RNA sequence: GGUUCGUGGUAGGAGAGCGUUCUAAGGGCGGUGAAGUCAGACCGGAAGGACUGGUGGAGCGCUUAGAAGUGAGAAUGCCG
RNA sequence: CGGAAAAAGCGGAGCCGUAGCGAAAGCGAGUCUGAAUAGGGCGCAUAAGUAACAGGUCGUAGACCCGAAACCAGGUGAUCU
RNA sequence: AAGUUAUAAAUGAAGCGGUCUGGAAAGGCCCGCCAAAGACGGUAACAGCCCGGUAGUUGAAAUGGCUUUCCCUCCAGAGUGGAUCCUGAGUACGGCGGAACACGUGAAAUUCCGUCGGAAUCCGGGAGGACCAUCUCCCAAGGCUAAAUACUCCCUAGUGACCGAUAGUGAACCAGUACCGUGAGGGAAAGGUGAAAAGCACCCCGGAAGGGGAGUGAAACAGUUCCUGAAACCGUGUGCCUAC
């Protein structure tokens, strides 16, 4: 404990402003001279422009949030190479393996990548291409 | 490593896993966990009064103009003698915890550092018929410890804590409590067979 | 406490995969007789918030 | 001042205007000072028209 | 350790450090005289640090890390 | 929960990221526009994040320090006038 | 009634070890010892072994509380039918005017207040964010309800990488005082002899104060604002310069 030497660049001496002119952070303390920004609490809102109309007020709102929106956990093909062929994949299996944690509103299997292995898969929705690839490897598909 | 009775006689050897005791230690990780623990210990019971908490104020002591005195607004402002403090301390928790994996690594590493430095002492058992700091100290010569040390126990061990607690450089713990800080705070590590087995199955 | 999101900005910006910010054009309400069709077929599109403006507004719509 | 039966009385709220200027006002109860039998005897008491339109004997 | 080009500087950016209070650990001096204070013609590239002597008459440094009520010459500053 | 104002262990609920596009339905390495298979926008191709620490800065909080004249609320005062 | 606890207490190991410095030893050096006791504090200086004590083990007459036991007190609960009957009325809702719900009348559900009106009541009634139907869930207009939560004028034991007398409570001292104000009300300053008063017998100057000796003490340039005693400031003396 009399030898502790933490990692280099993990720790760094706090700048201390306003304790001399040789610090370069002295008198004005990095604020300059005499404005709204040199004051305590000085500054303005994050989107203020001097009374010029802000960007957001010069452009229009758009849209609506749907309430019955369905967002689905996105599974690719690359993961499914982890399993020996002829077995059955399921949501419960994909959660147990930690590939998935949140079955958001369902599962969806997308054809990003490739499989090399014959598999029966079952899920809520498939993409056309992933269905094609699974079948082309001799796999099969069920819709839950 | 060697294994020796509390008589100090050779009892044989232990195989200690290189999963724990055989890795290269990460001294940087160990430092960080030491500081985490030492900083979680601190109590943070500091406090000071500002111009709103100091008793009084309210009256402007003189007119803004026409006295020749400097403009003032309270008898308790910071620049004033019995006045407020400007920011100062406020009660804080300093405690932070690094990730569990980092902390496990820290313990594995500090233990293997003790191994490499040849400051483990592993013994078949450790018991006392009754609490007796005489006997405990005599054991601490029958093994040439003679420095600051941490005893680790899980067995029967009915009286060892008491027979050690008066000694200043000595500490004892029940083998779950083994901390990075409590280890590094000492020089040598006196771990019984059952305690090391328990630490193994934990780690 | 946590920062409050700017809601008038949330209602009219949108993020991308690069973390940039998408917006809609803004002369597109009520005077289309005085705007060429070349102008309108472009204003009906989207746009990217510029760098100078993003540097100003990013911390209002970080979430 | 309150109805002896259902203790309704002056509560308070805002008076709003066009332009939604908010000012402060009170809603008093329609309390009428009339005889009733508080018990086996009579007494002249504040009572409310709501409570009076059926059920209480003058 | 060498060669070349450089080495005025306000606001301001970047870096490296001096020093103070406290903590932990290690290791130490100190009634044969601590901190502090007074004087000196010593030291270091700077902030600053030693040595000697006097006064004082019981605590204090060093090292590596850490945390801050961290360093004043001005505020018609505040108190004495 | 556990326990020394500890340390582990437990706790994976949730958070971030891994897939984006679209007002949305929805489709998905594509998607929206559009009649389009066209072009173009955003994405992918062109794959590194995450947790914690420290430094910088920003926001909310008095927020860097001191300083108004004034405003409001509860009270004290007609021993002067 | 029993037990336990709190409000007094008791017992409690081991060095007067030798020697050096010293005013004094708790400190240096060499020897030992105790420890379920090396917490703290004090003692002529830094003490586990000097003192009070601590660990541990015991104990409470009386009173108070808590936990158990007893007494005491008080205690109809399942089923099948379902002729009929009951199931919170000037409320529930609605209009107007306001308010609370994150929700600013907004498409404004839900809850509440004032005033107008004003239901069905079991083939009944409400809610599911206007509303209608269907479905689902539920019975208002009556009441009670511990625990987890919030705070600390207080008590007990304790902690602090909190202050250390311009700090820290305004207040370490007879401080909400003195003082100011008619009043409400504002509101200070101010700590340290020495281990022990051993607090200067006696002499001299002097009316006293104050001194100089003497003496006490390690020390009085520690003498009753008394540890240290910086700087501004005031002076005494003097080495060098200074009135074309
Ligand atoms: K000195
Ligand atoms: K495209
Ligand atoms: K002690
Ligand atoms: K409403
Ligand atoms: K319901
Ligand atoms: Mg710096
Ligand atoms: Mg800088
Ligand atoms: Mg500069
Ligand atoms: Mg300056
Ligand atoms: Mg200026
Ligand atoms: Mg200017
Ligand atoms: Mg400026
Ligand atoms: Mg304008
Ligand atoms: Mg105030
Ligand atoms: Mg330069
Ligand atoms: Mg300061
Ligand atoms: Mg009056
Ligand atoms: Mg002394
Ligand atoms: Mg309704
Ligand atoms: Mg209404
Ligand atoms: Mg409202
Ligand atoms: Mg109504
Ligand atoms: Mg609905
Ligand atoms: Mg002082
Ligand atoms: Mg004070
Ligand atoms: Mg003095
Ligand atoms: Mg001359």
Domain residue spans in chain D?
1-58
Whole-angstrom distance, CA of residue A144 vs CA of residue A125? 8
Q: Best of B30, B31, B33, B110 to disrupt the A interface by mutation (most A CBs within 10 Å)?
A: B31
| CB within 8 Å of D33: residues ≥ 6 apart | D44, D45, D46, D47
Largest CA distance in chain B: 94
Place of tokens 């009906």: C44
* H or E element, residue A125: strand A125-126
Whole-angstrom distance, CA of residue B17 vs CA of residue B23? 9
CA-nearest residue to A7 within chain B is: B28
In this structure, the number of other CB atoms found within 10 A of the CB of residue A131 comes to 18
The beta-strand segments (E) located in chain D are 11-16, 22-27, 31-36, 43-48
| CB within 8 Å of A123: residues ≥ 6 apart | A75, A89, A90, A91, A106, A107, A108, A109, A142, A143, A144
Q: Within 7 Å: CB of B33 and strand F?
A: yes
Whole-angstrom distance, CA of residue B150 vs CA of residue B187? 8
Residues in A touching C28 (Cβ below 8 Å): 60
CB A82, CB A117: distance < 8 Å: no
Q: Within 7 Å: CB of B165 and strand G?
A: yes
- Check if A67 contacts C (Cβ < 8 Å): no
A6/B184 Cβ within 8 A:
no
Q: How far is A68 from chain C (nearest CA, A)?
A: 19
Backbone angles phi, psi at A115, to 5 degrees: -105, 160
Based on the number of CB atoms within 10 Å of its own CB, is A111 exposed (0-12), middle (13-18) or buried (19 or more)?
Answer: middle
Q: How far is C42 from chain A (nearest CA, A)?
A: 15
Place of tokens 């029966």: A120
Interface of B with A (CB under 8 A): 27-28, 31-32, 34-35, 184-185
Span from the CA of B60 to the centroid of ligand 17 (angstroms): 26
Whole-angstrom distance, CA of residue B159 vs CA of residue B139? 14
Domain region containing C60: 1-63
Domain region containing A82: 73-143
Q: Within 7 Å: CB of B31 and strand F?
A: no
- Check if A32 contacts C (Cβ < 8 Å): no
| CB within 8 Å of C49: residues ≥ 6 apart | A55, C13, C20, C21, C22, C23, C57
Whole-angstrom distance, CA of residue C12 vs CA of residue C21? 10
Pairing of strands A140-143, B2-4: unpaired
Pick from C54, C63, C52, C62: nearest CA to C23: C54
Number of domains in chain C: 1
In this structure, the number of other CB atoms found within 10 A of the CB of residue A50 comes to 5
Q: Within 7 Å: CB of B79 and strand G?
A: no
Neighbouring C-alpha atoms within 13 Å toward the C-beta of B74: 16
Straight-line distance from the first to the last Cα atom of chain C, in angstroms, rounded to the nearest whole number? 15
Structure's resolution in angstroms: 2.9
Span from the CA of B54 to the centroid of ligand 14 (angstroms): 8
Whole-angstrom distance, CA of residue A119 vs CA of residue A80? 8
Whole-angstrom distance, CA of residue C25 vs CA of residue C13? 11
DSSP state of D38: S
Three state DSSP letters for A2-43: CCCCCCCCCCCCCCCCCCCCCCCCCCCCCCCCCCHHHCCCCC
DSSP chain B: -EEE-TTS-EEEE----TTTSSSPP-HHHHHHHHHHHHHHH---------TTTSS---S-SS-SSSSSSPP-S-TTSTTSTT---SS------------HHHHHHHHHHHHHHHHHTT-EEEES----SS--HHHHHHHHHHTT--S-EEEE--SS--SHHHHHTT-SSEEEE-SS---HHHHHTSSEEEEEHHHHHHHHHH-
Pairing of strands B10-13, B170-173: unpaired
Pick from B86, B104, B166: nearest CA to B131: B166
Q: Which residues pair with D33 in a beta bridge?
A: D46
Pairing of strands A88-89, A120-123: parallel
DSSP state of A99: S
CA-nearest residue to A6 within chain B is: B28
Please report, rounded to whole angstroms, the spatial distance between the CA atom of protein residue B115 and the C1' atom of nucleotide E34: 42
CB B122, CB B192: distance < 8 Å: yes
Whole-angstrom distance, CA of residue D26 vs CA of residue D24? 7
The coordinates were experimentally obtained by: cryo-EM
CB A100, CB A66: distance < 8 Å: no
Whole-angstrom distance, CA of residue D27 vs CA of residue A81? 75
Pairing of strands B2-4, B10-13: antiparallel
Span from the CA of B36 to the centroid of ligand 16 (angstroms): 28
Whole-angstrom distance, CA of residue A127 vs CA of residue A140? 13
In this structure, the number of other CB atoms found within 10 A of the CB of residue B109 comes to 22
Based on the number of CB atoms within 10 Å of its own CB, is B191 exposed (0-12), middle (13-18) or buried (19 or more)?
Answer: buried
Span from the CA of B144 to the centroid of ligand 12 (angstroms): 70
Q: Within 7 Å: CB of B89 and strand F?
A: no
Based on the number of CB atoms within 10 Å of its own CB, is C44 exposed (0-12), middle (13-18) or buried (19 or more)?
Answer: exposed
- Check if A46 contacts C (Cβ < 8 Å): yes
């Amino acid at each position: 404990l009399h030898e502790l030497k933490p990692s280099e660049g993990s720790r760094k001496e706090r700048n201390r402003v306003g304790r001399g002119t040789g610090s370069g952070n002295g008198k004005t303390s990095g604020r300059g001279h005499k404005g709204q920004k040199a004051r305590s609490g000085g500054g303005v809102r994050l989107g203020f422009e001097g009374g010029q109309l802000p960007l957001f007020r010069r452009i229009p709102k758009r849209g609506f949030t749907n309430i019955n929106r369905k967002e689905f956990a996105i599974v690719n093909l690359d993961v499914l190479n982890r399993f020996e062929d002829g077995t059955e994949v399921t949501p419960e299996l994909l959660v147990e393996t930690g590939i998935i944690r949140n079955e958001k509103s369902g599962i969806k299997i997308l054809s990003n990548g490739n499989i090399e292995k014959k598999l029966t898969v079952k899920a809520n929705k498939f993409s056309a291409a992933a269905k094609e690839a699974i079948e082309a490897a001799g796999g099969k598909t069920e819709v839950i | 490593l060697s294994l020796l009775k509390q008589d100090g006689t050779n009892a044989g050897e232990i195989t200690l896993n290189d999963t724990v005791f055989g890795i290269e230690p990460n001294e940087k990780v160990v430092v960080d966990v030491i500081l985490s623990q030492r900083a979680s210990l601190r109590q943070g019971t500091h406090k000071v009064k500002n111009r709103s908490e100091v008793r009084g104020g309210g009256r402007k002591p003189w007119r803004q103009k026409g006295t020749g005195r400097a403009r003032q607004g309270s008898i308790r402002s910071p620049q004033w003698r019995g006045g407020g403090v400007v920011f100062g301390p406020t009660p804080r928790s300093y405690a932070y915890k690094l990730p569990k994996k980092v902390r496990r690594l820290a313990i594995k590493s500090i233990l293997s550092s003790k191994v490499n430095e040849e400051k483990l002492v592993v013994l078949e058992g450790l018991t006392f018929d009754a609490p007796k700091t005489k006997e405990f100290a005599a054991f601490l010569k029958n093994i040439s410890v003679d420095t600051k040390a941490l005893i680790v126990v899980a067995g029967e061990s009915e009286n060892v804590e008491l027979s050690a607690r008066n000694l200043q450089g000595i500490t004892v713990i029940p083998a779950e409590s083994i901390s990075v800080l409590e280890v590094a705070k000492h020089d040598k590590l006196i771990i019984t067979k059952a305690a090391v087995e328990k630490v193994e199955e934990v780690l | 406490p946590k920062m409050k999101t700017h809601r008038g900005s949330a209602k009219r910006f949108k993020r991308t995969g690069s973390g940039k910010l998408k917006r809609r054009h803004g002369f597109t309400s009520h005077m289309f007789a005085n705007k060429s069709q070349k102008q309108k077929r472009k204003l009906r599109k989207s746009a990217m918030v510029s760098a100078g403006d993003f540097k100003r507004i990013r911390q209002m719509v970080a979430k | 001042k309150e109805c002896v039966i259902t203790g309704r009385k002056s509560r308070s709220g805002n008076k709003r205007s066009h332009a939604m200027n908010s000012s402060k006002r009170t809603w008093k109860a329609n309390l009428q000072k009339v005889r009733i039998l508080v018990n086996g005897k009579p007494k002249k008491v504040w009572v409310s028209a709501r409570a009076l339109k059926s059920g209480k004997v003058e």
